[PDB]
Design a protein around this ligand. Structure first.
Ligand SMILES: [Zn+2]
Ligand SMILES: [Zn+2]
Ligand SMILES: [Zn+2]
Ligand SMILES: [Zn+2]
Ligand SMILES: [Zn+2]
Lengths: 155, 51, 252, 114, 53, 209, 154, 97, 46, 142
């Protein structure tokens, strides 16, 4: 979230109900945002991954309540979007087909990657597993370096 | 276990039995759980393999 | 049997894996991570950890995926990743060595570039030019906290530590030089051993100076400059000849 | 970083008096500062001969000497100093004293003035 | 009179890479980051130069 | 202008498509310590750990070796060994010096042997020539412990000094030893005369220092 | 670096130019001088100093409790009788100046220091799911029970 | 504080050194004079350092005393100095540990 | 065997050409063929 | 092509915090990156300065690019305004300032620098949580 500066009205109707759920998130974030003296690259990456997951989760919760459950007013949702709470682009992506389970947006920036493609997470476990079986080796990848996303795919 | 990647029998677990020489055996397993029937020339022991 | 012995490892937990430097100097240089404005301190300090491999060695995240290279940290005895480590945690067996024997010229069993020229002190990660399986052991006085031991005892201790770590070819303690030459079958194994036993105490729990093993300076484990006395040389030559013969056979 | 530097950085806890005291405590232990024959650069006013190898070091020739305090002062409250030199060729310790009665120097078992 | 050719500003080029990513930040926070980052840079460079004093 | 990378068949992989990136003046070559383009390929897409080129193309050419494997381009043998074989039928002396190594690298002579390996004529001839040329218990009475251990295992801590020639095997189990005896180079418990003498001599030698 | 082959087992600083240290063999020193030398026949794991700063009790779990007088080096320590099976957890000197309270695993022995060595202030009566502690007066006790998760005051 | 010595023994530097000694244990055994009477050094590390320093000094002495003008009296003097150094070294090899 | 070369976009902060470090390099002349240096044909004054 | 992922600020913050006590063989390359970044630090400064929140603004949110290494952070947006509106705003601010001057017997001018040379500038995480930033400069309307 951003800081309130009397720009937007404090909150629409149903914020008081959801606020305590997404205020747990804030605590988690706070725990995350600090020097965990990781002393090690992988460990360091893990905290970032965790943070990313947390970010995703809040958005999902919001998204779930507004679209799937539909228990929150449109206005409130809009307000949330305007604030830093939800991710707008991510939500949009989710709403689109084939991107519903989506760890993060930068796992589908095809420009970013060295090989002109999407993140592996986006490959359904099924396909990778099949490939592995064909080869001889076991399941090859666990989670990507952008965000911890073991089997991000929509399956 | 016969391993599907490595293509051979690989050692998975070992258990000590607390108690003649068993010259034969049969494994059973169903939903109930895995048993080994251990046989001598004239007697047998049914041993369960539990978690 | 590391596979069916265990899965878990967790050698030294990520709470306490290491403090970063040890104070030489006055001020701490952020770019080199080394203390500056002074150099007083023998610097080599004994490893807080060690590879008790029978206990530690296990399946890793690497084993499943098909990693070639073994875990330096595991060897040292401080791989906080443990089962989620991508590098292998076991003493290099023969099969593994065979598998990575293509690459073993250019880089070590740890997957890190062997150099063209040896370091002047023969101190680390041997050259790709000279293949070697032969470790200089030194600072055994310092590694045992200046203990009045029998050379034989020392030799035995060395054997105990090193046999466990890899398939031994042959070992020699020397009173005059005050050293311990070890030779292995496989270069990779030797490398692993070196990694392990760098900065390690040779002492045991049963000894009276166990609680002050940290205050000493560890084993100075390095690469072996070939033995000049003639029988050894002859043996080496013979070995080389044999190798050549084998190569020829392979070719034809 | 520059010779005309106005203010040297101090740590956030630097009790200056305390620091001074500490320094003093670790000045008796100190190697340099707790010694005599502290160095100096000086030209030679006497223009003299090095007594061992007869090397004729002339007037105004520059040397890295050692200035040391002579405990026995001149009169009362005006100090006099021994000013050590080495001859260029042979490494014989020449020196001289500055007795200010004549507004000049005195040779001290090193060489002879001429 | 300015560049006819150069469309490619600095930021755009950076964006075109994978190494930069972008957020929305409070300006004070950004400033703080700059101060810290900048400070780090100046220390790091200095330490590299060897002058740690 | 740039020449192409010299990566061997076994070095590179078993597949009909590999993607690699070139990094111009990436690293310094290990031999020469002189900037050159790193090629680094992943072999199979998903198979872990990259294969970066460790040497400059020129140096590779000189030694006639894989830029990854550091092995003979032709026979896939370590430079020493390949050169040694040729000698048997002169070897390279890489000059391990800051300045001189670079100079050596820049020279283009094919150091030593490399020429022979390169040419079908010469390599083949060498091979032919080579072919022609070709055509508890103490233990007493040199060979390595890894062989001894293997032997012991087959028969089913193992100390052996060589100056002594006195191998004190300690299975630490009465079962292992009693199996070991029945299933079967003097081997007691915890030209014979000649052997004894030799052993004694060895012992003496061990004990004088 | 203290000059003793034996592990230092007691170190206290509010004795005020000197601190006191003690060996597991009963070497007691001020840092400097040694008021008592190492014995061959004891092992201590801890110590406690009396408020008048002259009596030092050294002790171990197994029942050894020896009181030393720091004012006279030539005075032999006093051995206090504690049965060996009752594990000594802690020793405190009470505020009154004359109770030495010995907190054992399941029981408390309180010695009266005015009287012959071994004289109790009161008889020992017992009151492994319960830890406890006594205040400096030696007359208040809080006991915790791990079964009921509760604090009882005695 | 020209000529470097002054700078070295400037108060700030001294303070810094003291701080270092306090926290981490950086001493410069070059910087302080080695003590005359051993057995006023309970720590082992310190003793070792002192020994090392004396060895270094001895080595330095040795290096210079084989200079070409051998008949000069400085060399002769050093010969006694060398002996003294050796003696000191020997002393430092005391048998407490 | 056919093989695809690529150039990966390195980060714009890190040194572009991490290989080079202003190294001195003596080169051999490598003149194998021999230049013919051809020509034709009072000392106290000169 | 496809636009940049709008990342969370949290991630950025975390990255920043990690590279405070940076002295391992881990992030060797991050130090290099940092060193490189000096090239663009003046640009960054220019950007940040340009985005300065105007006195009619409690706190400006701003677009930010940042190297994933944590070496440099550019304010990305370039602040454009409706010129007449901007002018009006400035005028209003001026008026407010004048009013303040009229009011106050002593006007507490800042001390410089605002934080001590010893004291390292507080992270933003000390005062996200703090109370609503006090009211900015906008005159009493009608
Ligand atoms: Zn994903
Ligand atoms: Zn993702
Ligand atoms: Zn992904
Ligand atoms: Zn590991
Ligand atoms: Zn190859």
């Amino acid at each position: 979230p951003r800081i309130k500066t009397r720009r937007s009205k404090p909150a629409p109707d149903g914020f008081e109900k959801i606020k305590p759920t997404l205020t747990d998130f804030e605590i988690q974030l706070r725990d995350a945002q600090k020097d965990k003296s990781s002393k090690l690259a992988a460990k360091s990456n893990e905290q970032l991954w965790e943070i990313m997951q947390l970010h995703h989760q809040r958005s999902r919760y919001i998204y779930t309540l507004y679209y799937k459950r539909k228990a929150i007013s449109k206005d409130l949702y809009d307000w949330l979007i305007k604030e830093k709470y939800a991710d707008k682009l991510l939500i949009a992506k989710w709403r689109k087909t084939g991107y519903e389970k989506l760890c993060c947006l930068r796992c589908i920036q095809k420009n970013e990657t060295n090989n002109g493609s999407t993140c592996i997470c986006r490959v359904p476990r099924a396909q990778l597993e099949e490939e592995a079986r064909k080869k001889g080796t076991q399941v090859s990848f666990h989670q990507c370096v952008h965000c911890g996303c073991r089997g991000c795919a929509s399956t | 276990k016969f391993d599907k990647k490595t293509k051979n029998w690989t050692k998975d677990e070992e258990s000590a039995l607390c108690l003649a020489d068993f010259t034969d055996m049969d494994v059973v397993c169903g939903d109930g759980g895995i048993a080994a029937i251990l046989k001598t020339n004239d007697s047998f022991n049914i041993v369960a393999l539990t978690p | 049997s590391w596979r069916d012995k265990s899965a878990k490892v967790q050698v030294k937990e990520s709470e306490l894996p290491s403090s970063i430097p040890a104070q030489t100097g006055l001020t701490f240089n952020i770019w080199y991570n080394k203390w500056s404005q002074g150099f007083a301190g023998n610097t080599r300090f004994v490893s807080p950890f060690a590879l008790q491999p029978q206990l530690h060695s296990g399946k890793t995240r690497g084993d499943n995926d098909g990693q070639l290279f073994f875990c330096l940290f595991f060897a040292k005895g401080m791989c906080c990743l443990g089962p989620k480590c991508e590098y292998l945690h076991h003493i290099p067996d023969e099969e593994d060595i065979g598998k990575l024997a293509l690459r073993t010229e250019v880089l070590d069993c740890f997957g890190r570039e062997k150099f063209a020229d040896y370091r002047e002190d023969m101190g680390g990660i041997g050259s790709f030019r000279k293949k070697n399986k032969t470790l200089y052991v030194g600072g055994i006085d310092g590694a045992l906290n200046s203990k009045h031991l029998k050379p034989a005892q020392i030799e035995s201790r060395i054997r105990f530590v090193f046999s466990r770590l890899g398939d031994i070819d042959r070992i020699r303690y020397v009173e005059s030089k005050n050293c311990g030459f070890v030779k292995f079958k496989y270069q990779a194994n030797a490398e692993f051993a070196k990694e392990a036993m760098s900065n390690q105490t040779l002492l045991l729990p049963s000894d009276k100076e166990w609680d002050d093993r940290r205050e000493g300076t560890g084993l100075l484990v390095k690469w072996a400059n070939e033995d000049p006395d003639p029988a050894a040389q002859k043996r080496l030559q013979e070995e080389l000849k044999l190798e050549s013969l084998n190569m020829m056979v392979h070719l034809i | 970083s520059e010779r005309k530097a106005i203010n040297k950085y101090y740590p956030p806890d630097y009790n200056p008096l305390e620091a001074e005291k500490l320094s003093r405590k670790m000045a008796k232990k100190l190697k340099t500062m707790n010694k005599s024959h502290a160095s100096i650069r000086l030209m030679t006013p006497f223009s003299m001969r090095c007594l061992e190898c007869n090397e004729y070091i002339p007037k105004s020739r520059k040397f890295n000497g050692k200035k040391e305090l002579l405990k026995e002062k001149y009169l009362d409250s005006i100090k006099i100093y021994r000013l050590t030199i080495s001859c260029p060729r042979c490494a014989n310790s020449i020196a001289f004293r500055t007795d200010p009665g004549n507004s000049d120097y005195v040779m001290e078992v090193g060489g002879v003035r001429n | 009179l300015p560049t006819n050719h150069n469309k490619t500003k600095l930021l755009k080029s950076l964006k075109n890479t994978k190494y930069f990513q972008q957020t929305t930040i409070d300006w004070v926070e950004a400033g703080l980051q700059l101060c810290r980052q900048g400070h780090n840079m100046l220390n790091l460079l200095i330490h590299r130069k060897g002058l740690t004093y | 202008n740039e020449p192409p990378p010299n990566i061997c068949e076994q070095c590179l992989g078993d597949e009909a498509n590999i993607r690699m990136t070139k990094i111009p003046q990436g690293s310094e070559c290990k031999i020469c310590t002189l900037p050159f383009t790193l090629y680094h390929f992943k072999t199979s897409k998903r198979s872990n750990n990259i294969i970066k080129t460790l040497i400059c193309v020129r140096c590779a050419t000189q030694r006639n070796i894989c830029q990854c494997c550091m092995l003979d381009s032709r026979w896939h043998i370590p430079i020493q060994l390949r050169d040694h074989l040729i000698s048997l039928v002169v070897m390279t002396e890489e000059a391990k010096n800051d300045m001189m190594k670079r100079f050596l690298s820049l020279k283009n002579v094919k150091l030593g042997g490399a020429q022979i390996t390169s040419d079908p004529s010469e390599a083949d001839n060498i091979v032919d020539k080579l072919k022609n040329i070709l055509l508890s218990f103490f233990l007493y009475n040199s060979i390595p412990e890894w062989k001894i251990t293997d032997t012991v295992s087959q028969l089913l801590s193992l100390i052996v000094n060589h100056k002594a020639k006195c191998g004190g095997l300690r299975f630490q189990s009465s079962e292992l030893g009693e199996r070991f005896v029945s299933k079967i180079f003097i081997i007691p418990w915890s030209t014979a005369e000649n052997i004894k003498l030799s052993l004694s001599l060895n012992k003496l030698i061990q004990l004088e220092l | 670096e203290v000059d003793s082959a034996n592990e230092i087992i007691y170190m206290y600083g509010h004795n005020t130019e000197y601190f006191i240290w003690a060996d597991n063999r009963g070497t007691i020193g001020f840092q400097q001088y040694i008021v008592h030398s190492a014995k061959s026949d004891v092992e201590y794991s801890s110590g406690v100093l009396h408020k008048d700063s002259l009596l030092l009790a050294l002790y171990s779990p197994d029942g050894i409790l020896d009181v030393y007088n720091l004012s006279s080096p030539d005075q032999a320590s006093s051995r206090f009788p504690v049965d060996e099976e009752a594990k000594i957890k802690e020793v405190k000197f009470a505020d009154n100046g004359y109770w030495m309270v010995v907190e054992c695993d399941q029981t408390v022995v309180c010695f009266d220091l005015r009287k012959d060595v071994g004289t109790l202030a009161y008889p020992t009566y017992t009151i492994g799911t319960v830890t406890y502690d006594i205040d400096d007066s030696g007359k208040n006790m809080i006991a915790y029970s791990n079964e009921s998760n509760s604090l009882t005051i005695y | 504080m020209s000529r470097n010595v002054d700078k070295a023994n400037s108060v700030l530097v001294r303070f810094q050194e003291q701080q270092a000694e306090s926290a981490g244990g950086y001493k410069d055994y070059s910087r302080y004079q080695r003590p005359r009477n051993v057995s006023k050094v309970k720590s082992i590390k310190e003793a070792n350092e002192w020994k090392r320093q004396v060895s270094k000094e001895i080595k330095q002495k040795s290096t210079r005393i084989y200079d070409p003008s051998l008949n000069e009296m400085q060399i002769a003097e050093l010969n006694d100095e060398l002996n003294n150094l050796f003696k000191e070294w020997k002393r430092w090899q005391w048998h407490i540990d | 065997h056919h093989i695809e070369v690529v150039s990966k976009q390195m980060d714009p902060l890190l040194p572009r050409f991490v290989g080079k470090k202003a190294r001195k390099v003596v080169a051999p002349t490598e003149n194998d063929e021999v230049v013919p240096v051809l020509h034709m044909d009072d000392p106290n004054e000169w | 092509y496809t636009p940049k992922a709008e990342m969370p600020p949290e991630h950025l913050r975390k990255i920043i915090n990690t590279h405070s006590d940076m002295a391992s063989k881990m992030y060797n390359t991050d130090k290099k990156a940092f060193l490189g970044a000096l090239k663009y630090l003046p640009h960054a400064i220019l950007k940040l300065l340009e985005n300065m929140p105007h006195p009619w603004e409690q706190a400006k949110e701003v677009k930010v690019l940042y190297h994933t290494s944590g070496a440099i952070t550019f304010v990305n947006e370039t602040p454009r305004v409706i010129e007449p509106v901007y002018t009006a705003q400035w005028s209003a601010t001026w008026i407010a300032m004048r009013r303040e001057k009229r009011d106050r017997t002593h006007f507490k001018r800042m001390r410089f620098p605002p934080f001590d040379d010893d004291e390292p500038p507080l992270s933003y995480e000390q005062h996200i949580e703090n109370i609503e930033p006090l009211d900015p400069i906008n005159l009493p309307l009608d």
